[PDB]
Amino acid sequence: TVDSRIPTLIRNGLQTKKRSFFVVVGDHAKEAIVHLYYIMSSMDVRQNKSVLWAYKKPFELFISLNDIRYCYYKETDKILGNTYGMCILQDFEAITPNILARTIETVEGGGLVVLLLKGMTSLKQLYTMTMDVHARYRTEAHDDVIARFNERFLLSLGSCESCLVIDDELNVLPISGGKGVKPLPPPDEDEELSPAAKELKKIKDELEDTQPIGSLIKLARTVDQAKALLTFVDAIAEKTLRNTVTLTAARGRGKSAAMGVAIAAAVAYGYSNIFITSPSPENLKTLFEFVFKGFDALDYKDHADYTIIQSTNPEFNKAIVRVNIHRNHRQTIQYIRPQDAHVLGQAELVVIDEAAAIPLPLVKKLMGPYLVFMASTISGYEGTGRSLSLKLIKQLREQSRSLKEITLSEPIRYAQGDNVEKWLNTLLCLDPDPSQCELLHVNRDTLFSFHPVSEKFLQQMVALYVASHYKNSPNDLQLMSDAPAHELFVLTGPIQEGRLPEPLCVIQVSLEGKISKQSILKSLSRGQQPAGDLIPWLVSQQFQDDEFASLSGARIVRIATNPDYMSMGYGSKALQLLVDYYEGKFALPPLFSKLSERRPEKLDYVGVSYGLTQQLHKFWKRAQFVPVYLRQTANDLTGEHTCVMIRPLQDGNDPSWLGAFAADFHKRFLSLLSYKFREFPSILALTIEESANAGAMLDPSNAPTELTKAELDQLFTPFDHKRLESYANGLLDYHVVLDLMPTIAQLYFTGRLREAVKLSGLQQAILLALGLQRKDIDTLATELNLPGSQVLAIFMKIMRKVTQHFGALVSG
Amino acid sequence: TVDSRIPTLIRNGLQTKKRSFFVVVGDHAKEAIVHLYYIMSSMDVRQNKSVLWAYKKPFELFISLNDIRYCYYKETDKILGNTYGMCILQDFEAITPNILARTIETVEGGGLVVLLLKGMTSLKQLYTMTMDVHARYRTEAHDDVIARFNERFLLSLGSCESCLVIDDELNVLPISGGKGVKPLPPPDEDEELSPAAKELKKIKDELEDTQPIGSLIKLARTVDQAKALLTFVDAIAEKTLRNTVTLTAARGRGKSAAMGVAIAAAVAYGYSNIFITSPSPENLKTLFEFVFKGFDALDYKDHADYTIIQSTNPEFNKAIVRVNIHRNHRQTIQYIRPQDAHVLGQAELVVIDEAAAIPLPLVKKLMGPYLVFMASTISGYEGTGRSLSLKLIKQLREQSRSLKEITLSEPIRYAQGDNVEKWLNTLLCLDPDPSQCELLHVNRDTLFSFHPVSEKFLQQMVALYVASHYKNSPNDLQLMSDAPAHELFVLTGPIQEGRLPEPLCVIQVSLEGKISKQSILKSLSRGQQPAGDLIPWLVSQQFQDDEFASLSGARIVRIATNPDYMSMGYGSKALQLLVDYYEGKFALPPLFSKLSERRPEKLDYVGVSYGLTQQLHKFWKRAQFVPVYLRQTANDLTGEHTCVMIRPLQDGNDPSWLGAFAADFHKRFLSLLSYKFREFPSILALTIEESANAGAMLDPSNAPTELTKAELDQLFTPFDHKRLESYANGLLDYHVVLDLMPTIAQLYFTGRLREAVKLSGLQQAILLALGLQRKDIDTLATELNLPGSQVLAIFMKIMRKVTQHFGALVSG
Ligand SMILES: CC(C)(COP(=O)(O)OP(=O)(O)OC[C@H]1O[C@@H](n2cnc3c(N)ncnc32)[C@H](O)[C@H]1OP(=O)(O)O)[C@H](O)C(=O)NCCC(=O)NCCSCC(=O)CSc1ccn([C@@H]2O[C@@H](CO)[C@H](O)[C@H]2O)c(=O)n1
Numbered sequence A, B: 001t002v003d004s005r006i007p008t009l010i011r012n013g014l015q016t017k018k019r020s021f022f023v024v025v026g027d028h029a030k031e032a033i034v035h036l037y038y039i040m041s042s043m044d045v046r047q048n049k050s051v052l053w054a055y056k057k058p059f060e061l062f063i064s065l066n067d068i069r070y071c072y073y074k075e076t077d078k079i080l081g082n083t084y085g086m087c088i089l090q091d092f093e094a095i096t097p098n099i100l101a102r103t104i105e106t107v108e109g110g111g112l113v114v115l116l117l118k119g120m121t122s123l124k125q126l127y128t129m130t131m132d133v134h135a136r137y138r139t140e141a142h143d144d145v146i147a148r149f150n151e152r153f154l155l156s157l158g159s160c161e162s163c164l165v166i167d168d169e170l171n172v173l174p175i176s177g178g179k180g181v182k183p184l185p186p187p188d189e190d191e192e193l194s195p196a197a198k199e200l201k202k203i204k205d206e207l208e209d210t211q212p213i214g215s216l217i218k219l220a221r222t223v224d225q226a227k228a229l230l231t232f233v234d235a236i237a238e239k240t241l242r243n244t245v246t247l248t249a250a251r252g253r254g255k256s257a258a259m260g261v262a263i264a265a266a267v268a269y270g271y272s273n274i275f276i277t278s279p280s281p282e283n284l285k286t287l288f289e290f291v292f293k294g295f296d297a298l299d300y301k302d303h304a305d306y307t308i309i310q311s312t313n314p315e316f317n318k319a320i321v322r323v324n325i326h327r328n329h330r331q332t333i334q335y336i337r338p339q340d341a342h343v344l345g346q347a348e349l350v351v352i353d354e355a356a357a358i359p360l361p362l363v364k365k366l367m368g369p370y371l372v373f374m375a376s377t378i379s380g381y382e383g384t385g386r387s388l389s390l391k392l393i394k395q396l397r398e399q400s401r402s403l404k405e406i407t408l409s410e411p412i413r414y415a416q417g418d419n420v421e422k423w424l425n426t427l428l429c430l431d432p433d434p435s436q437c438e439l440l441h442v443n444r445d446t447l448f449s450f451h452p453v454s455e456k457f458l459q460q461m462v463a464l465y466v467a468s469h470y471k472n473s474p475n476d477l478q479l480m481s482d483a484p485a486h487e488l489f490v491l492t493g494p495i496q497e498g499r500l501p502e503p504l505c506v507i508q509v510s511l512e513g514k515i516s517k518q519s520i521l522k523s524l525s526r527g528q529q530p531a532g533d534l535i536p537w538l539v540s541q542q543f544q545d546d547e548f549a550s551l552s553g554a555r556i557v558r559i560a561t562n563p564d565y566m567s568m569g570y571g572s573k574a575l576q577l578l579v580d581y582y583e584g585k586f587a588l589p590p591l592f593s594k595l596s597e598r599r600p601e602k603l604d605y606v607g608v609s610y611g612l613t614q615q616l617h618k619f620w621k622r623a624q625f626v627p628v629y630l631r632q633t634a635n636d637l638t639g640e641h642t643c644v645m646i647r648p649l650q651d652g653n654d655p656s657w658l659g660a661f662a663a664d665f666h667k668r669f670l671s672l673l674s675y676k677f678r679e680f681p682s683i684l685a686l687t688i689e690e691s692a693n694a695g696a697m698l699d700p701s702n703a704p705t706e707l708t709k710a711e712l713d714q715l716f717t718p719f720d721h722k723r724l725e726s727y728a729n730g731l732l733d734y735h736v737v738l739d740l741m742p743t744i745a746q747l748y749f750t751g752r753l754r755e756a757v758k759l760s761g762l763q764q765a766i767l768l769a770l771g772l773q774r775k776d777i778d779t780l781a782t783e784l785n786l787p788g789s790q791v792l793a794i795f796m797k798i799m800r801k802v803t804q805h806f807g808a809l810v811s812g
């Protein structure tokens, strides 16, 4: 027999269209899965869909009778947009939170999400079991790893009413969170129906006579989807290039289907050029599938009324890039990259998928005098933080021609308020005067113990980081929980007993370094790297230095503040407090440990690796950080170059080891502006150069030397001096004296000419651009918001200062 | 009374629809013009159009009764595409051939082209009268100018049967070429009609029922125009993106009108994106006027069915750049520059106006998988040489999807075979073993004497230069004729008496130099230049040298060979013969003077200024020329940088004055590749650098020195050497060692490392690109037609040679 609660839970899930969670432990989980599929199928006939099975690397009749799809863990990106009647996970040791989010959301309501666990003598051994991902966290310095993610995972089950844990013998355990489940009253489909189903069929039958909306509204499955289609069509039918409709919805709500049917409606309404801009064409799979579904519903014929152009040469073979329409009239659905805004001159409809994840300048450039459709995932898996969506909406409101804001709430595959969706959104967390504040260290042994106060505080800090993330990734939660040396610091205001403090700033610090010199030389003779550390293993490779990585240091993995309290001084105060704590200025575990009650580790430096940005760089420089490295190949999804800043926090020790690194980086950066850096704005490059020089000034031996006649004559021939003097007098065109620009720029920005001649910020920026970035006058004028004549007018005054110094130098 | 031949000629012109030429001499030409307008108007009533009057800076009733348009000589570009019933030219001293061509072609058949000459005691004083343009030819070295253009102008009249020369008293002179004119028999318009007029009305009434061709064929005025419209519409109605129709016709035949009505037909046929690519939007004035005429004939309404977008911010205010159509669907007529081929992704119809004048790579890029319309002016004023049109047609035939070739012959404003058009196409000339050949000097005193043999030979050489010219300019004829020091050299094969030799190569040499040092210093202290000379006044400004321009030199203004005999060795042989002639190797004027019968001038150098091109540079370098200067701003109409090459022809004299210039240019060019030169192909830049180094080797003191440890340690720190050695071993990514690339490239290409390490052509080109041009691996791989991996694979082998040399240098 079987426990009554298993068929009861399955029946409740089938009737209420909600998912059911089952966890099987033992060595013969196949029998349990077969018996759970038989029970699920015996009560309902309209849900017998395919079964998804995921592994890293009776029953015999069961496999040969039902459609079973096998998917690898690394191939879970291939099942995006599908829908399966029951999902199976085989290897616990491999399910990262990314895998769980990707593989659970693709189950229709009433199905079963079955997770198989290996036979265990006591569930109490789950908290210490070898993750296949733990191998990446461990390092030579820190080898042991205490698994805390599994601890919270097992405890989270008790908070889900649809989650049942069963054994090989099909017996419920007390850990199960749905042992108190009760049968629901039988339904009556003769007259009783959900109000949503009545509303949808009403909004469908009302517009059935009209075309093409009548035939393109029979594809929507939710009321919110129908309303989204209605407003999209009422903006398309308006045929006004002064309209802009944005669609923000959680993952799985059906943004792609609504936008695809809207694109089909735009095609049917007589639109010639339609452009879809997305970060990657592989995201445009379900969208184009629903565009094709709308075309089919519009009585179009394949290969006779439309041809599909698919890009096979690059990596994304399956990606659709172009669709041609030649039935009503020549129409094209072209996919362009977000950086290709130069092709939107004749754009009639530009649809920006995942507009939140697109960098803000790219979104600003993609908008024009046409009709713009926008999509954003503001919650759920792969979502965007609330801060970025708020910034985008604020920009749209400030610029607006006309902006329309619609939202989807009701999911498609499962009923609203699904229990399993609630649990997987809790386990993966997928949804005062600055001087008065104090910093506390958050203990990770209790923060992941699923205590109600601990869980509430964990959700608080997690949500803070969520907003500060162009794309949400729940793997960072596992990295934070199971890392061997990651420390979490939070900044709270003055708080009294009985009230949980409100986190205004959260700092995650990772301990790095203490790598043996033998390992350094072993790695430096090859290209392979342990990849455990970042700042040491990167400097030791870039500078070919075998002494830096043997130090002890801290990497600030993530520092985020409350978006409502940003730019008020909380982040800088938290950073200063952390630095002072690491400088030895402070002399059931409790969740919060004050900084004055734990002994800091002896650290020689603190470092950070982050995407370059003028505001971020200004903040880090104000925090006494100096650059050591700057990547040349910009990040494809972000558009920013990785920059590494290191601070010599330890006092009473010579900060000369960092002086050499800063000086080496400073001079390299000077002429690296012609290599993958030509695109940098002049002001940003000037600030980075100034910061690198300030860092290089730590070493007294790196102080610049004066310029003498003996070395000057080795650089400029007397005819070059004559040309410079002629230009300074205004008797020569600036194009003639232009190969001397690299030499003068290098002389000034390496310190030889810095003391002799005084240049302001604008003159320094123009000199840097024209000398090291090799920019034109037009580009420099546009970047600096100055007329072309004024750039040269202030450029001659730079020459009238260098020429005078050179003349006074040669004469005396 | 009036001479009978004046009303007779006017009546013949009115009846035959041919223009009439009248030249008036005296101080009261107003009376003659009034009496010629009265006579013209008294016989015909359907031609009383506006009168065009051109000046540099009875009759009273005449001005206030007829529409008179006044146009300045510098503003004659503003009357392109118009049509006037009678043209008047007031100032002889200002009518350049460009003005004559621009102002004569805008007269309808049967009108009068009246040229006013100041009262002259004897027409014999015309050959010596002060041109307002002569001031530009004269120079300090050569001041006197003998006017030969006026000489041929006066004699050319006798070859025109419709040209009458009259005085203030209206008396015909023997110089008149139409004194033997006789009255034509009166016509009969009741039944007799021209076959062309019957053919046109037949091809119109046949398609009257059909639309939109029926309403868009009533705008054509010639049979050839109607056929061009028919084939354009039959290619548009075909709606095939595998069609390409080119239209080659002389100036004034009506290419613009046919193409405009074709664009209107394409709009009416349901084309969404239509792009018109032209060298300048001001040429797209009559084309868009006829597009608008076709729209009006298609019953479109202004400001309700189409809106016109005109670019007012730039210089071309009147230029139309965009036309929007919203009749049933959004259609657009966008003007793009020829270098904007990246916007033709959705192009449904790309119409290339003046395709011959567009550089060949730009035309190759503008063509795609759509319908392409092409226009070319292969004859007449502002035309293109036959060689360029032949190259374009050959490229089209070799690439062809489908190519259609149509031609227009019959002009619009005047009858075919017009007499005045014949004369203005003669006055302005607007239409063997290599070792066995010999070079002859063509005397300019008899070449412009209008002798039949002299005129035939002048037309021969002129036609040779015409083909070698992206845009024909008849001002070069006046410059050749009236220049004070221009010498013409021609290359002919073995020829016997009684037969005029066939010119296989024509060389035009201009004598330059001998500028006083006082004038050099006077000009060098300002920006103003006499502009008489080019090579001296350019080197003396770029190099700030006060001794070069005082030499004596020759500038090869134009060297062209027969396009049928190109790349066979005639040009190089002619150049070598000219150089030997100037090196003193040869020890009713006759038209041809052998090189052994005239004393060459003592010349120190021979130079040439030309648009840079790999083939042209290779030819000049083979001719022992070395560069001295290279412009940064490429020519807008051509896309090529001006390069100046100077050869030290004189033997027995030290060529060290040029060694300094070549070395200064060579070292500057090295790092100037990052300034307006980044776009140069690697091979071309390498060849230019090699040629500049070969030129700099003339001075023994410019020989490169070895590389020593003392100077090497001043460039690379030991950590830089460690990084280079690590990269050479393949243990480091190539991105790390990239700021050392400028230093290594400069060391190798300035000669210090040239002897120590041996590099092939490909390695040298890659090193030059990556070091001095700062190109990426992808761009270099695409330019060199090699995979990206192979570029780096051969790039590491460059480093494995430099690193070994550096190690052997530091060790010992
Ligand atoms: C700025 C805050 C501190 C709070 O700012 P705060 O409260 O403190 O304001 P405050 O008064 O104190 O100072 C006033 C000053 O702040 C400035 N400011 C003001 N407002 C803002 C603002 N909104 N934003 C920014 N600055 C602002 C302003 O410039 C100035 O304002 P003023 O104009 O002077 O007044 C806080 O970070 C925040 O906002 N937002 C969170 C940003 C965040 O998340 N991390 C921050 C840096 S960490 C990134 C990592 O470390 C990630 S790991 C990683 C990832 C990938 N990769 C590579 O890429 C991968 C490729 O596959 C691969 O893995 C690897 O290769 C890698 O290596 N490592």
Ligand SMILES: CC(C)(COP(=O)(O)OP(=O)(O)OC[C@H]1O[C@@H](n2cnc3c(N)ncnc32)[C@H](O)[C@H]1OP(=O)(O)O)[C@H](O)C(=O)NCCC(=O)NCCSCC(=O)CSc1ccn([C@@H]2O[C@@H](CO)[C@H](O)[C@H]2O)c(=O)n1
Binding pocket: B468, B556, B557, B558, B559, B560, B561, B565, B566, B567, B568, B569, B570, B571, B572, B573, B608, B609, B610, B611, B614, B615, B616, B618, B619, B635, B642
């Ligand atoms: C090449 C020929 C000698 C006959 O060639 P040739 O018969 O001799 O052939 P050959 O056997 O002897 O040698 C075999 C070698 O010839 C090569 N090759 C073979 N075939 C061709 C080919 N088709 N084309 C080219 N090379 C070819 C090949 O690379 C190789 O062939 P291989 O592959 O080695 O066998 C002849 O020129 C010709 O073709 N066509 C006429 C080109 C022409 O007209 N001038 C030539 C240079 S002058 C330009 C001025 O001087 C104009 S003034 C001015 C204008 C503006 N500006 C500035 O711009 C303005 C801005 O407003 C402003 O005014 C000012 O700032 C200024 O400063 N000055």
